[PDB]
């Protein structure tokens, strides 16, 4: 047979036109190689496995996220959208709410429905299409202009998500619990469709009210079926009845977010913990609907009183803003705060309404503290990057202190970039708090770092920038959110208003009302909260007179307030440091910040010292600290050494915020002040970090391990190091790769990759040996990742003659637990040799298939390894493009397998050997193995026929 | 310092769960480390090991409520260690909570190392009626975790080898499990080891009523790792 385009396409149809979820990744890789011009006639065919649209979309996205244009992604997107429109054109014309309890009310409808979703010939295609649609919608936020979802398909996608949740709930009513993947796909489409503004403008309109109440009814019924046993309620203390039902159901759900859907609560133990994030996000996005938003923001304790106006909002449920004479009661105020903080604000008018409300409450014992906290959180709400008042879409905007590394954007740097982005992707997926992420998709993590030149900065450009003091994946407000350089850079401050909402007026009003409120018998618990609110809002101050007023207020407060506060200093010190170091810390007045820091670092209780360290980090940001009057440096370094030498053997005992901020300060000192932070000062903590990274999984928590390790990776990657502690750093990296925890092994592997790519003969062989050992005795995740980074490591460190024996020896082994990965490693290596004109070394090594191959007790595995090897060492396309097909069958000695193996070996014998004496040398190895059995004897016959 | 614990935890539970405050310094936790985390050590150094760990059982539950699963798991395990060689049931409940938190942290090889410790303490101390309620959760958990991780034969302890061996037709028996759950577990082990998707899907749909929420999470994870493996980058 001629192994050509048509043979290949037939072989692709043999695996990607069934209905089976065995080898979906390899199926996507096989469809990838189909000609781009003839790919959509291949996926829009009625037999196509619809379970491949998620792997095809993921592979296309990984090809586009790599910059290159992807045609498989275009095909999979076209097919997903066409299939969605198709499966939506079957639903009945008019839509009735899906009262998941009302006994079949629209009989005809509720029967024309069952006939279209009670059967498995269509219902089975709803979640396998929802998986594709959720894999598409989760990456529309990072696509080009012509790859977003069109404006025409938005109504159809809303109807499809409605129908998918309706079908899932119908299954739950009649049949048993659908499936974990079906549930997940339906809720994923729901969440990701209410997360996009293009579809949020369609669901939340007026002709889609029945669909909104269907979503609400179905989500409530699913939460009831999943989270509670039959016979109990969710919580443990005119117009279409369904509208009021929807209002009350969303109110109950929002009230549940505190207990039943709070991950780790004593009541969330009923939800299977893979539905908690999806349901939280869906409930938030539903509560923000204009239909139910007006009702949802009113606490229940208001209806428990005599409040019941006559509403109207084109639905009949637009209630007015709570009369502030109700919030003077505490519990009602705390519930209102919870509603407006969890839900955020849906528009500028709503921000202004709740602003004026909390102002009227702000004018009294403790209502003032609650009002101040609500106010500061409310102004911080406009800080978020993606969509400003949307807690489902957005997270708090942070500009890190660390500048982009200059070692990258080089020759070796741009290769370390790739091979460390891989390891970082996996460390993200394996240890990140998926806090800004709701769905299950792994390779989706992003960071809230908008450019200060704006559009969000792509995550693969933030390798070692994100302040090494915040937990990997944690997006809450951390003290030190916005760096001071960012303050000088965004609004040009010599050392406007936020999204849709005038924050200059809010900031100025708050600054005047705070200054006039703490300088002259205000209680202590009020002064401390005003200072905390000032520190938190000073992330939104724009002018320099705002910061100067803040500084003069805070220093007069320091002078007036007594020293016996201990709970005011935690916010007095970092706020004063932020102000004084935005003013370009000078000698005249911004100098006695060093005295304040020196005094607060010898404190008695920890939070004052953590605040002092955040203030120190605020100063060095780009102040000439002190002004070459840096006499704070010796103090900072002595404190850091004395209090990190103790907390290095037992770390889980001491607080984690303290250790994290101490490490962040130490790394900033070593990298930015390497001539004042003494010399060995680095090595000293490159030992503290050694005694911390080398601890057992109990003696070193995971987040502290990953900070210290990523900070060390930056310290080495930044050229601000002597070659004496860097030499002390290349040794520590290798002792941590042979660890049991897979994510710790992956972190140590990333540090080793930087130790190798930055500081640049048998050492390289020791390192490749440890990599092969992590393939051979690791978990499938870690082993797949290491085998995915290995081809580049190999082709970039040592010439192919050195390791070509080792790669084949690790492929052909009995101690090899995952030969299905080493197949791809050998493939990448050989196909790299077929580009650099070294296609003669590869044949020299394949002619070394005498004893290594053809000698493997499971003859099935012997012929499988022979087929993998002869596919790898093939200069022909359509033969090298079937390795995903041969990896999908690691045993399975069928007859078509043998036909494949004979064809592949015949192609090799015809195209690569070309030497008759070597041809006979090749022929007289199947005769020793002989095997009159099918595989070799058929190969010998076909070779005699050639 | 035990009612001060209530004060300084509610002063954090307010801003976290009651009135969600997306403006938290993170201030009352680094201080929540006092009283609780503080006497946690004081109780020991002066001596009250019996109830000393109860303070940590409250502080760990608080930490898990706030969204710190890993440190909550650490404190839970420490409590289990503190109460162990005097009270089996207390430390077994603590270890169960620690395994739950570690599964919240997506730390599977550390959760399996606690399930194996429970399962092996329940036996060597089952010499009641709840021991054969931890041996029925730990066995199913451990099997689902070993099916999710899939360790290679090299780094696979004798314990896990014995367990994953118990559930193939070379073996029939039920130990402490109910017969139907054992048959489902055996069919699931045999179907996953033989790269069978539809069998595992049918088994997920059939087993959902018999498994708890944690183990249903784990069975969904097994099914997902089977369908779309984690590490390919796509």
From Swiss-Prot, chain A:
Keyword flag Ubl conjugation: yes
Paired cysteines (S-S): none
Gene Ontology CC entries for this record: autophagosome; axon; centriole; cytoplasm; cytoplasmic vesicle membrane; cytosol; dendrite; early endosome
Top-level taxon of origin: Eukaryota
GO molecular function: beta-tubulin binding; dynactin binding; dynein intermediate chain binding; heat shock protein binding; identical protein binding; kinase binding; p53 binding; phosphoprotein phosphatase activity
Keywords assigned by UniProt, alphabetized: Acetylation, Apoptosis, Cytoplasm, Cytoplasmic vesicle, Disease variant, Endosome, Intellectual disability, Lipoprotein, Myristate, Neurodegeneration, Nucleus, Phosphoprotein, Repeat, Ubl conjugation
Sequence motif Nuclear export signal, location on chain: 282-291
One GO-annotated biological process of the protein: positive regulation of cilium assembly
Tissue expr: Expressed in the brain cortex (at protein level). Widely expressed with the highest level of expression in the brain (nerve fibers, varicosities, and nerve endings). In the brain, the regions where it can be mainly found are the cerebellar cortex, the neocortex, the striatum, and the hippocampal formation.
Disease per UniProt entry: Huntington disease: A neurodegenerative disorder characterized by involuntary movements (chorea), general motor impairment, psychiatric disorders and dementia. Onset of the disease occurs usually in the third or fourth decade of life. Onset and clinical course depend on the degree of poly-Gln repeat expansion, longer expansions resulting in earlier onset and more severe clinical manifestations. Neuropathology of Huntington disease displays a distinctive pattern with loss of neurons, especially in the caudate and putamen. Lopes-Maciel-Rodan syndrome: An autosomal recessive neurodevelopmental disorder characterized by developmental regression in infancy, delayed psychomotor development, severe intellectual disability, and cerebral and cerebellar atrophy. Additional features include swallowing problems, dystonia, bradykinesia, and continuous manual stereotypies without chorea. Some patients manifest seizures.
Family named by the database record: Belongs to the huntingtin family.
Free-text comment about domains: The N-terminal Gln-rich and Pro-rich domain has great conformational flexibility and is likely to exist in a fluctuating equilibrium of alpha-helical, random coil, and extended conformations.
Complexes and interactors: Interacts with PFN1. Interacts through its N-terminus with PRPF40A. Interacts with PQBP1. Interacts with SETD2. Interacts with SH3GLB1. Interacts with SYVN. Interacts with TPR; the interaction is inhibited by forms of Huntingtin with expanded polyglutamine stretch. Interacts with ZDHHC13 (via ANK repeats). Interacts with ZDHHC17 (via ANK repeats). Interacts with F8A1/F8A2/F8A3. Found in a complex with F8A1/F8A2/F8A3, HTT and RAB5A; mediates the recruitment of HTT by RAB5A.
Name this polypeptide is given: Huntingtin
From Swiss-Prot, chain B:
Subunit relationships: Interacts with HTT (via C-terminus). Interacts with RAB5A. Found in a complex with F8A1/F8A2/F8A3, HTT and RAB5A; mediates the recruitment of HTT by RAB5A onto early endosomes.
Record keywords: Acetylation, Cytoplasm, Endosome, Nucleus
An example Gene Ontology CC term for this record: nucleus
Native source organism of the sequence: Homo sapiens
Protein name: 40-kDa huntingtin-associated protein
Alphabetical GO biological process terms: negative regulation of proteasomal protein catabolic process; vesicle cytoskeletal trafficking
Function recorded in the entry: RAB5A effector molecule that is involved in vesicular trafficking of early endosomes. Mediates the recruitment of HTT by RAB5A onto early endosomes. The HTT-F8A1/F8A2/F8A3-RAB5A complex stimulates early endosomal interaction with actin filaments and inhibits interaction with microtubules, leading to the reduction of endosome motility.
Primary location recorded for the protein, binned into one broad class: cytoplasm
Residue range from the parent sequence: 90 to 371 of 371
Gene: F8A1
Positions of transmembrane segments: none
Tissue: Produced abundantly in a wide variety of cell types.
Pathology noted in the entry: Up-regulated in brain tissue from patients affected by Huntington's disease (at protein level). In a Huntington's disease mouse model overexpression of F8A1/F8A2/F8A3 impairs proteasome activity leading to the accumulation of mutant HTT and causes defective mitochondrial functions.
Superkingdom field: Eukaryota
Compartment(s) of residence: Cytoplasm; Nucleus; Early endosome; Nucleus, Nuclear body
């Amino acid at each position: 047979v001629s192994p050509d385009k048509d043979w290949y396409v037939h072989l692709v149809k043999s695996q990607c036109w069934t209905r089976s979820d065995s080898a979906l990744l390899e199926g996507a890789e096989l469809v990838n190689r189909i000609p781009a011009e003839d790919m959509n006639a291949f996926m829009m065919n009625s037999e196509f496995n619809l379970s491949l649209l998620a792997p095809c979309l993921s592979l296309g996205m990984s090809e586009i996220s790599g910059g290159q244009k992807s045609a498989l992604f275009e095909a999979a997107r076209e097919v997903t959208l066409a299939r969605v429109s198709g499966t939506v054109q079957q639903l009945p014309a008019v839509h009735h709410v899906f009262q998941p309890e009302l006994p079949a009310e629209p009989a005809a409808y509720w029967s024309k429905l069952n006939d279209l979703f009670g059967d498995a010939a269509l219902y089975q295609s709803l979640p396998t299409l929802a998986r594709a649609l959720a894999q598409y919608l989760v990456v529309v936020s990072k696509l080009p202009s012509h790859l977003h979802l069109p404006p025409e398909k938005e109504k159809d996608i809303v109807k499809f998500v409605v129908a998918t949740l309706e079908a899932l709930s119908w299954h739950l009513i009649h049949e048993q619990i659908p499936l974990s993947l079906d549930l997940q796909a339906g809720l994923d489409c729901c969440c990701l469709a209410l997360q996009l503004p293009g579809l949020w403008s369609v669901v939340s309109s007026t002709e889609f009210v029945t669909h909104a109440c269907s979503l609400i009814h179905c989500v409530h019924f699913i939460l009831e079926a999943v989270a509670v046993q039959p016979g109990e309620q969710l919580l443990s203390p005119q117009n279409p009845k369904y509208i009021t039902a929807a209002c009350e159901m969303v109110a109950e759900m929002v009230e549940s977010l505190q207990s039943v859907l709070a991950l780790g609560h004593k009541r969330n133990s009923g939800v299977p913990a893979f539905l908690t994030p999806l349901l939280r996000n869906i409930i938030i996005s539903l509560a923000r609907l204009p239909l139910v938003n007006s009702y949802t923001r009113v606490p229940p304790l208001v209806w428990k009183l005599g409040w019941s106006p006559k509403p109207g909002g084109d639905f009949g449920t637009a209630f007015p803003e709570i009369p502030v004479e109700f919030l003077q009661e505490k519990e009602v105020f705390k519930e209102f705060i919870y509603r407006i903080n969890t839900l955020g604000w849906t528009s500028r008018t709503q921000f202004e309404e709740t602003w004026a409300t909390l102002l009227g409450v702000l004018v009294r014992t403790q209502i003032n503290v609650l009002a101040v906290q609500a106010i500061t959180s409310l102004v911080l709400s406009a800080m978020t990057v993606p969509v400003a008042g949307n807690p489902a879409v957005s997270c708090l905007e942070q500009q890190p202190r660390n500048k982009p590394l200059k070692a990258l954007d080089t020759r070796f740097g741009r290769k370390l970039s790739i091979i460390r982005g891989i390891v970082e992707q996996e460390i993200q997926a394996m240890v990140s708090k998926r806090e800004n992420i709701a769905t299950h998709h792994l390779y989706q993590a992003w960071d809230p770092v908008p450019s200060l030149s704006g559009a969000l900065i792509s995550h693969e450009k933030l390798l070692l920038q994100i302040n090494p003091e915040r937990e990997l994946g944690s997006m809450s407000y951390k003290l030190g959110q916005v760096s001071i350089h960012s303050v000088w850079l965004g609004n040009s401050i010599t050392p406007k208003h936020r999204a849709g909402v005038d924050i200059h007026s809010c900031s100025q009003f708050l600054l005047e009302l705070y200054s006039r409120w703490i300088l002259p018998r205000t209680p202590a618990i009020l002064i401390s909260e005003v200072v905390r609110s000032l520190l938190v809002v000073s992330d939104l101050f724009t002018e320099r007179n705002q910061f100067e007023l803040m500084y003069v207020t805070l220093t007069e407060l320091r002078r007036v307030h007594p020293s016996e506060d201990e709970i005011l200093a935690q916010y007095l010190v970092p706020a004063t440091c932020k102000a004084a170091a935005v003013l370009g810390m000078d000698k005249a007045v911004a100098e006695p910040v060093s005295r304040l820091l020196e005094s607060t670092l010898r404190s008695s209780h920890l939070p004052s010292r953590v605040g002092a360290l955040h203030g120190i980090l605020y100063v060095l940001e780009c102040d000439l600290l002190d002004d070459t009057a840096k006499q704070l440096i010796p103090v900072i370094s002595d404190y850091l050494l004395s209090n990190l030498k103790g907390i290095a053997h037992c770390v889980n005992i001491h607080s984690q915020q303290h250790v994290l901020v101490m490490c962040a300060t130490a790394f900033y000192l070593i990298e930015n002040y390497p001539l004042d932070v003494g010399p060995e000062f680095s090595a000293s903590i490159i030992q503290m970090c050694g005694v911390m990274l080398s601890g057992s999984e109990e003696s070193t928590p995971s987040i502290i391990y990953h900070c210290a390790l990523r900070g060390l990776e930056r310290l080495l990657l930044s050229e601000q190091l002597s070659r004496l502690d860097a030499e002390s750093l290349v040794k520590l990296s290798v002792d941590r790769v042979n660890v049991h925890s897979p994510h710790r092994a992956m972190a140590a592997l990333g540090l080793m990759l930087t130790c190798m790519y930055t500081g640049k003969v048998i050492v390289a062989m020791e390192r490749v040996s440890v990599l092969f050992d992590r393939i051979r005795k690791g978990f499938p995740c870690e082993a797949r990742v290491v085998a995915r980074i290995l081809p580049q490591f190999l082709d970039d460190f040592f010439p192919p003659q050195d390791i070509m024996n080792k790669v084949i020896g690790e492929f052909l082994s009995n101690q090899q637990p995952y030969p299905q990965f080493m197949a791809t490693v050998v493939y990448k290596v050989f196909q790299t040799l077929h580009s650099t004109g070294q296609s003669s070394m590869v044949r020299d090594w394949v002619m070394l298939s005498l004893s290594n191959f053809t000698q493997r007790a499971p003859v099935a595995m012997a012929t499988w390894s022979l087929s993998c090897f002869f596919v790898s060492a093939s200069t022909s396309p359509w033969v090298a493009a079937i390795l995903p097909h041969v990896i999908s069958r690691m045993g399975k000695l069928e007859q078509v397998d043998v036909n494949l193996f004979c064809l592949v070996a015949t192609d090799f014998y015809r195209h690569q050997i070309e030497e008759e004496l070597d041809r006979r040398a090749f022929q007289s190895v199947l005769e020793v193995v002989a095997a009159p059995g099918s595989p070799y004897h058929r190969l010998l016959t076909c070779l005699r026929n050639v | 310092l035990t009612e001060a614990a209530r004060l300084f935890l509610r002063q954090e539970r307010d801003a976290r769960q009651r009135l969600v405050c997306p403006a938290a310094y993170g201030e009352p936790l680094q201080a929540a480390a006092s009283a609780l985390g503080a006497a946690v050590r004081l109780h020991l150094e002066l001596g009250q090991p019996a109830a000393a760990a109860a303070l940590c059982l409250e502080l760990a539950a608080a930490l898990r409520d706030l969204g710190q699963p890993a440190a909550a798991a650490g404190h839970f395990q420490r409590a289990a260690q503190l109460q162990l060689p005097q009270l089996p049931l207390a430390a077994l409940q603590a270890l169960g909570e620690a395994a739950s938190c570690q599964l919240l942290a997506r730390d599977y090889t550390g959760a399996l190392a606690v399930f194996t410790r429970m399962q092996r303490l329940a036996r060597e101390h089952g010499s009641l009626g709840a021991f054969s309620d931890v041996l029925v959760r730990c066995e199913v958990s451990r099997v689902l975790l070993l099916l999710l991780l899939q360790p290679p034969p090299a780094k696979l302890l004798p314990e896990h080898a014995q367990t994953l061996e118990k559930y193939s037709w070379e073996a029939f028996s039920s130990g402490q499990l109910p017969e139907e759950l054992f048959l489902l577990l055996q069919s699931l082990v045999m179907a996953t080891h033989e790269k069978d998707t539809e069998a595992i899907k049918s088994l997920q749909v059939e087993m959902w009523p018999l498994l708890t929420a944690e183990q249903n999470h784990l069975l969904h994870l097994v099914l997902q790792e089977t369908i779309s493996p984690s590490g390919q980058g796509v």
